[PDB]
């Protein structure tokens, strides 16, 4: 019944809508609008860099939804580079920040 206006996965906002029938009449058919955001309190500021401070402020301009990101995507891989000094050989190596989703 409910149509979907927004399915953003970066902000996990699901804007939907539905019109409910009145008490056996075509009048006062009140419309609805459901919004469901799921805030992550453990994610960092720069989601692709595990050194930036924690994410405190959350700004949601609903107009844009219907680029800084807040949450990860179950269908994608995030990677980075770290210096491994193994054998006295400082070496930048790629690292799967979000493993199990890079297979």
């Amino acid at each position: 019944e409910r149509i979907v206006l927004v399915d953003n996965k970066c902000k996990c906002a699901r804007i939907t809508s539905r019109i409910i029938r009145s008490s056996e009449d075509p009048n006062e058919d009140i419309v609805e609008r459901n919004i469901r955001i799921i805030v992550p309190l453990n994610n960092r500021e720069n989601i692709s860099d595990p050194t930036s401070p924690l994410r405190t402020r959350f700004v949601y301009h609903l107009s844009d939804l219907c680029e800084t990101c807040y949450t990860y995507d179950r269908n994608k891989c995030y990677t980075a580079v770290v210096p491994l000094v193994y054998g006295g050989e400082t070496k930048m190596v790629e690292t799967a920040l979000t493993p199990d989703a890079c297979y």
């Binding site: 009140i30 609805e32 609008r33 990860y72």
Partner: protein, 128 residues
């Protein structure tokens, strides 16, 4: 020479209180030089020309070179329980895609309630 801006409006709230009919208005403004006409299709099927009444291009109140036009259409009141969205369209030479289909439905419009349900969790990182 500018992009012809277009808009659409739904029937008035007090209009849906006599139970006779309803009107939907598609406003076309700009389109310099004045070259537009509107065909009101529903579900991809063009409606009869006797329903929608386009009149003429008219210069804007302050018109250096701009113009505007208005076109309405008449429907039945009892048919709005399903909407059908009654699409509008415009055509002009100063458009990259020469079509700007515009359509609205009972569902589209002013929200009469805002049921926000935000949640806080420490496991939303993945946002499954």
């Amino acid at each position: 020479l500018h992009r012809p801006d277009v808009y659409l409006l739904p029937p008035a709230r007090e209009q849906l209180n006599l139970r006779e009919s309803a009107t939907i208005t598609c406003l076309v403004t700009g389109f310099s030089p004045a070259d537009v006409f509107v065909q009101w299709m529903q579900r991809g099927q063009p409606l009869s020309p006797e329903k929608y009444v386009t009149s003429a291009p008219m210069p804007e109140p302050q018109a250096p070179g701009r113009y505007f036009a208005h076109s309405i259409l008449t429907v039945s009141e009892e048919e709005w329980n399903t909407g059908e969205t009654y699409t509008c369209v415009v055509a002009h030479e100063a458009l990259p895609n020469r079509v700007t289909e515009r359509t609205v439905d009972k569902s589209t419009g002013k929200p009469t309630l805002y049921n926000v349900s935000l949640v806080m969790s420490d496991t939303a990182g993945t946002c499954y």
